[PDB]
Structure formats: structure tokens, C-alpha cells
């Protein structure tokens, strides 16, 4: 009681500060820009060869190779330019949750319900691709094991703990704590100095890898956070909330600049990503169709279509020349 | 076109990858999976004889393979990791029938499972454990079902009774009352897309695998017939 009141007072002060210095709104200030216009997205290639439903995918650095895994417990390295099985690595555990492609392109990592996302090599000296290091110390499952460089991998577990790992020793170097519920998705910043984590408690935390502490907090949703993507400029980011709504925040403002939602949709989001220019925002849904939102007018430019079942993952190339989506139907699609 | 000589190696790699993936598909389709579930410390690890995400079991039966799954390393929270099991052949639910207090929690968990969106179309096998322990407790009679449940006041054993030697009217009544509660839960809303298969067992039994075999056969037969739209 002597501390709950203090917490309430501090929270009220923070809310008042957020409310202040909020003159006008994004929809009010950007309303004079022309609409992007209806888009004519269509499939320029499809990818087949999986054994079960797909969960996650990721683009390479060269924007030509992408890696994905499925519930079948296999990692497949494709080649969009000329559809080809570059590699096919099956994991020891048939379960998997995420995959990642090292910027150098010489390593990949993935994990599942076994609570250990291990490191996989691709530049084998002898000639055979073999697992390099298995990282143990996390209690829950892993919902993202994003790479940082050839020797550092950021990871977020299902046990409210995220930590940065040093691959060489295979031992945690720093531990992030503070999230109330389960952490689901994380994304790095262009300067690789900060990353954002969304957790299943209607809150996403901003951190600092070098120092290891929460710098800020954001709360604007009515349910858990399913996906999160960083704006290219590094001054904002979007989150995919299960409450059938996508919201955007700004670090400098410390608030929610504008939100996307409509009554037409009653399905929570599954995956979100940004276009290279930033005007287009790619939002997934549960109804097998992936919408495209005008990131600066709150409008919809025309949904995609032509996928069998729930879309699991999504992404865009580094150069932004293509978009890739995965679903539970074991198919992978690539769009113009 | 000399660069195409590397395309030749790429095509060879594709051929090898699909050659292995063919056998992978064959074996994966052949295999059968079973998601185990139940309250911790409810005879789960001992339900099956075992002579044959963390805990998995392979056991052939009359030239058919089964891959049971027991994910028991995580936290109490289940609202997220359960969604990753939308395509299992069937579920095996095991409950310690002797825990009257915990029975309500088990009931609510089962109701949530049944009405879950992504599990709306999976039928669940049902295992009730410690029938002998329940019999001993009820014969002792110090406790009582009437203590925790009011519906036991006016319950009459159904005409479909099927007791065994020793089983008295009282123990039969208790057994079938619990089973009828679970059946009511299942029948509240089924849509015909899934049901439950009640069973009874002790911890020193062996016919379990046969029961799972029969249940799976019946469920798959019904699935095929449904695809025939009758």
C-alpha cells in the first residue's frame, strides 16, 4: 500500500506526460498526401517440397537464398532465382519454432519446444554440413533465435527471458528480465544497438544489448503481441496483436502514432513486415489472406490471396525486390 | 553457357534432395503420432507398459508404428504452445480419478480443450486412472462425492451398465457418474467432427496399447466415411 500508491502516482505521471506534447495526430498531419493506389500483387514463383506445415522463414544477405523449416523437423535452403534445394538439414528434434540466417551466410540456427536452438554450419571444411553448437540454459521454448554476427545470436524464450549468447563458449553473456508473460517475437535495429521484444502481456519492451536493461515500454493493445517489426529509419516499429489490430509506436514520441484496424476483420495478426520504402506495411492474418496497409494513411491497398491455410511467417528481402510467405499447407510463395 | 555447368551441379543437388525427401515423406506419412496430456503426477508416465517435445515413445503394434508425445518441460501457461498441435491423429487424456478436488480443474481444462478454436477437429481418447484407489476410497466412505458435487444426489446408474466381479453398486455409480459428466461435456457441443472414447484402467495393466489401436482405427474409419459424406 505504501508502494502501490507510489507506483500508481508514477504511472499517472507517465500517462500525463505521454498525453502532453501530443499536438495533433499522424492521421491529421499526413492526410494531405495522395493515396498509394491499388496494388496488383501476384505470384511470380511458388516453392514446394516440404513435408508438413511451415512455421518460420528468413531471407539471406544476398537476397537470393532463404531458409525455412516446418513442423516436419527439417531445414530447407531454397533459391528463389532458380528454385533449387541448396540444402536439406533435418533437426534432431522433429519440433521447431524459428529459423535464422546469419548475415555472413555461413551459419544458421533454429529451435523448437526442446528449449535449445542449436547452431548449424554451412561452410563445412570436410564437405559435410554438421551442427556446431547447441545452446542450453533456457527453460521454456524459443520463439526467436535471431543472429547478430558470426559469433553472437539474440534469443527470446517462452519463459519470459531473453538473452544474448556468445557462440564460441556457448554460454549466456547477458540476461534480459522484466517481461511479465511469454515473449514471442523480437527484431533488431539497423544499427544493431537496440532491439524490441513483444510479450504475451499486451506490452513490448525496448532494450540495449550493450548495457542490458529496459529503456522504455509500450502498451496499446488489448491482447498478446504475436509479431513485431522494426521501421527501417529506426524511429518506430509495428506489432501484430492477436486482438485483430496493428499499432505503430515512435521511440522519440514514446506513444502510439496511429493504428490499423477495421470491423471487416475479426482475426488476430500472425506476422508483420515493412516495405523497403516504408510506405507499404505487410500484415498477415488468420483467414489465409495477407493485407497491405498504407503505413501513412491507415488505408488498405488491396489484400493478396491464393494461399491454402493459416499463414505462419512473412518477410521481405534486404533490397525489397520480393516478398515471401509461409503457411501451414507446406507451401512457400514469392510475390513480385 | 559455361556458367550453366554450375546449373548442372545445382540440378544434381536438387535430384539428390528430392530422392531423400521421397523416403522422408513415405516414413513420415507412415508414422502415427499421439499427443499425451494430463495433470502432472496422474499416472501419466506409467499409463502404458512401454515394453517396445521432451518425452517421446516409439512402439510398434501388429506392424503399425506410433509416436507418443509428452511435452512436460514448460510452465503452467498453455495458451500459446498448444496451438502448435493442430494436426495430431488423436489426443490421450489421463486424469487421476481419485482426486475429487482436482477433478473440477481437470474438467475445466477438458472443456477448454474441446472448445479451443484450433483443436475443434481432434477427437480425444480418454483414460481414467486408479479405479482401484477410487473403489477403496468410496468403500471406506469417510469422504463422499456429495461433499463436492450436488448432482450425485439424484443420479441413477444408466441401463447401459456393465460391471465386473466385486464392483459394487456404489463403485459402479461413482465410475459412471464421472464418465457421464465427461460425456455431457463432450456432447454439449460436438458438431459431429470429434468425440471422446471413455476408458477405465489401473497402473498394472497392459491392454492399453490395444485400446489405443482400436480407438485410432475407429476414428480413422469415421474420418474416411465422412470424406465419403456418408
Amino acid at each position, epitope marked *: 500500500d505504501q508502494l502501490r500508491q507510489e507506483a500508481e502516482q508514477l504511472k499517472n505521471q507517465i500517462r500525463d506526460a505521454r498525453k502532453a506534447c501530443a499536438d495533433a495526430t499522424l492521421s491529421q498531419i499526413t492526410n494531405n498526401i495522395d493515396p498509394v493506389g491499388r496494388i496488383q500483387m501476384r505470384t511470380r514463383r511458388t516453392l514446394r517440397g516440404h513435408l508438413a506445415k511451415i512455421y518460420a522463414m528468413h531471407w539471406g544477405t544476398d537476397s537470393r537464398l532463404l531458409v525455412s523449416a516446418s513442423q516436419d523437423g527439417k531445414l530447407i535452403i531454397w533459391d528463389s532465382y532458380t528454385t533449387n534445394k541448396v540444402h536439406a538439414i533435418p533437426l534432431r528434434s522433429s519440433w521447431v519454432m524459428t529459423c535464422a540466417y546469419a548475415p555472413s551466410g555461413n551459419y544458421v540456427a533454429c529451435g523448437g519446444l526442446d528449449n535449445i536452438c542449436s547452431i548449424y554450419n554451412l561452410k563445412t571444411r570436410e564437405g559435410n554440413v554438421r551442427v556446431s553448437r547447441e545452446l542450453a540454459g533456457h527453460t521454456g521454448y524459443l520463439s526467436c533465435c535471431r543472429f547478430l554476427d558470426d559469433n553472437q545470436i539474440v534469443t527470446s524464450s517462452g519463459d519470459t527471458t531473453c538473452a544474448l549468447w556468445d557462440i564460441e563458449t556457448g554460454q549466456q553473456t547477458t540476461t534480459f528480465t522484466g517481461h511479465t508473460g511469454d515473449v514471442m517475437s523480437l527484431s533488431l535495429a539497423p544499427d544493431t544497438r537496440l532491439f524490441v521484444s513483444g510479450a504475451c502481456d499486451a506490452s513490448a519492451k525496448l532494450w540495449d544489448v550493450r548495457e542490458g536493461m529496459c529503456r522504455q515500454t509500450f502498451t*496499446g493493445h488489448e491482447s*498478446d503481441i504475436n509479431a513485431i517489426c522494426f521501421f527501417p529509419n529506426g524511429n518506430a516499429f509495428a506489432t501484430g496483436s492477436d486482438d485483430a489490430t496493428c499499432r505503430l509506436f515512435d521511440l522519440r514520441a514514446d506513444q502510439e502514432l496511429m493504428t490499423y484496424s477495421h470491423d471487416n476483420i475479426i482475426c*488476430g495478426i500472425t506476422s508483420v513486415s515493412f516495405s523497403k520504402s516504408g510506405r507499404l506495411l505487410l500484415a498477415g492474418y488468420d483467414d489465409f489472406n495477407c493485407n497491405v496497409w498504407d503505413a501513412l494513411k491507415a488505408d488498405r491497398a488491396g489484400v493478396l490471396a491464393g494461399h491454402d491455410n493459416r499463414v505462419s511467417c512473412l518477410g521481405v528481402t534486404d533490397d525489397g525486390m520480393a516478398v515471401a510467405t509461409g503457411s501451414w499447407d507446406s507451401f512457400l510463395k514469392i510475390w513480385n | 553457357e559455361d556458367q550453366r555447368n554450375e546449373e548442372k551441379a545445382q540440378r544434381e543437388a536438387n535430384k539428390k534432395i528430392e530422392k531423400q525427401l521421397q523416403k522422408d515423406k513415405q516414413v513420415y506419412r507412415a508414422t502415427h503420432r499421439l499427443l499425451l496430456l494430463g495433470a502432472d503426477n496422474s499416472g501419466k508416465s506409467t499409463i502404458v507398459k512401454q515394453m517396445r517435445g521432451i518425452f517421446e515413445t516409439k512402439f510398434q503394434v501388429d506392424k503399425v508404428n506410433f509416436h507418443m508425445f509428452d511435452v512436460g518441460g514448460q510452465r503452467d501457461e498453455r495458451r500459446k504452445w498448444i496451438q502448435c498441435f493442430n494436426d495430431v491423429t488423436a489426443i490421450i487424456f489421463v486424469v487421476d480419478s481419485s482426486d475429487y478436488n482436482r477433478l473440477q480443474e481437470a474438467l475445466n481444462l477438458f472443456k*477448454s480443450i474441446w472448445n479451443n478454436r484450433w483443436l475443434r477437429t481432434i477427437s480425444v481418447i480418454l483414460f481414467l486412472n486408479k479405479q482401484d484407489l477410487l473403489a477403496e476410497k468410496v468403500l471406506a466412505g469417510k469422504s463422499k462425492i456429495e461433499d463436492y*458435487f450436488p448432482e450425485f444426489a439424484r443420479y441413477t446408474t444408466p441401463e447401459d451398465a456393465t460391471p465386473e466381479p466385486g464392483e459394487d453398486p456404489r463403485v459402479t455409480r461413482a465410475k459412471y457418474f464421472i464418465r457421464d459428466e465427461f460425456l455431457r461435456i463432450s456432447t454439449a457441443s460436438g458438431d459431429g467432427r470429434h468425440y471422446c472414447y471413455p476408458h477405465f484402467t489401473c497402473a498394472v495393466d497392459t491392454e492399453n496399447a490395444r485400446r489405443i489401436f482400436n480407438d485410432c482405427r475407429d476414428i480413422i474409419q469415421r474420418m474416411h466415411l465422412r470424406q465419403y459424406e456418408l
Partner: nanobody
Amino acid sequence: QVQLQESGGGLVQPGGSLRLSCAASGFTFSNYKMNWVRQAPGKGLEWVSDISQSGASISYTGSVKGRFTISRDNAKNTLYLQMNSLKPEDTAVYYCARCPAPFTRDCFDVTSTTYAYRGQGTQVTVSS
């Protein structure tokens, strides 16, 4: 901005009526199904009651059936729970949690001291 405060509660002799309230704040009340939970000393949580979106359908636990009336007032965002004819063994701290997914009927909102959509708390006891 998900906040849940629980009014009502306190001391009362056995068999003496009471009232309780759980007025949410910051989320669409009408789109979720509510729950009431409790935990007596030396025991874990346990489901007690709930209510559908519109209030048409209800449920209850075995012990208190016919003694508590759970009413949901959608417009005022306050969920009542009338307490009637108490018994000495029913003393426990009470909460109020909206299970996560709106527009559904499945809930997993009794996690062991780990759930996040749970109210703060309220105290009710009985004595002579």
C-alpha cells in the same frame, strides 16, 4: 492500459450477504468472457464462475452453486458477483480475469501466479 480493480470484500459473519465488483479499464469489455477465481491459504487457484459475452450463458462450480449470482453489466464495464449465505470454509482472496482471446469460448486464465490479465485482489473472511 489493461487495469482491473476489485471493490467490495471484507469481514462478515457466516451467512451474511456481501457484494463484489471488478470494473475493468482500457480494453473492449463486451468482446471477452469474464471469470472469477480464488485461492484459500495453503492451496492453489481454482475456477469459480464465468459468463459468456452477452450474459445469456453462465456456469458455476460445484460447491457454491445456487449461492452466488454472477451478473455482467456490459454498458458500465463492471462485473458483479453477489455473495449470499456464506460458509466458514469459503474464505480466500478473490480476483477477476478476462481470459485472453476475445470472440471465443476457450480460456487458460488460471496460470500458477503467472497470468497477466488478472485483477489485483480483494479480501473476504468469515468469523463469529
